[PDB]
Amino acid sequence: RSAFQCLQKFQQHNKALKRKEWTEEEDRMLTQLVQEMRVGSHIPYRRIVYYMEG
DNA sequence: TGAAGAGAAACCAGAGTATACCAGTTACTTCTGTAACTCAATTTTCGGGTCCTAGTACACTGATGG
């Protein structure tokens, strides 16, 4: 196998990749981010994520 | 009085003979390039579109299950 394939399978079957549980600090971060990058009813979550960690 | 040849009327292949193609070459032309202006016809080439089928991202929906 390649190192890339092994890492790829590990990630695609990892469980600590995402955080899977919300914290109040993370909620404040999400709210501050959404209020900054809304343009209306348009909330680009793919642009928002890249400031949310995990 | 037959014998060993003498003569005679048939076939039969073959060697010149007769064709039968089949190349073997001498002049005698055109056709190049360059130049030029002309104009139209035609081609090439060339950057960009154009349409189309097939995925792709992405926010949301709609359950779903523990």
Swiss-Prot record:
Its assembly, as annotated, is: Part of the SNAPc complex composed of 5 subunits: SNAPC1, SNAPC2, SNAPC3, SNAPC4 and SNAPC5. SNAPC4 interacts with SNAPC1, SNAPC2, SNAPC5, BRF2 and TBP.
Tell me which residues make up the Myb-like domain.
17-54
Protein name, per record: snRNA-activating protein complex subunit 4
| Highest taxon in the source lineage | Eukaryota
Question: Organism classification, top ranks?
Answer: Eukaryota, Metazoa, Chordata, Craniata, Vertebrata
Identify the disorder associated with this protein. Neurodevelopmental disorder with motor regression, progressive spastic paraplegia, and oromotor dysfunction: An autosomal recessive disorder characterized by delayed motor development and developmental regression after the first year of life, followed by progressive spasticity with gait alterations, paraparesis, and oromotor dysfunction. Most individuals have cerebral, cerebellar, or basal ganglia volume loss.
Q: Which residues of the full protein are shown?
A: 328 to 381 of 1469
Say what the protein does.
Part of the SNAPc complex required for the transcription of both RNA polymerase II and III small-nuclear RNA genes. Binds to the proximal sequence element (PSE), a non-TATA-box basal promoter element common to these 2 types of genes. Recruits TBP and BRF2 to the U6 snRNA TATA box.
UniProt organism field: Homo sapiens
Subcellular location per UniProt equals: Nucleus
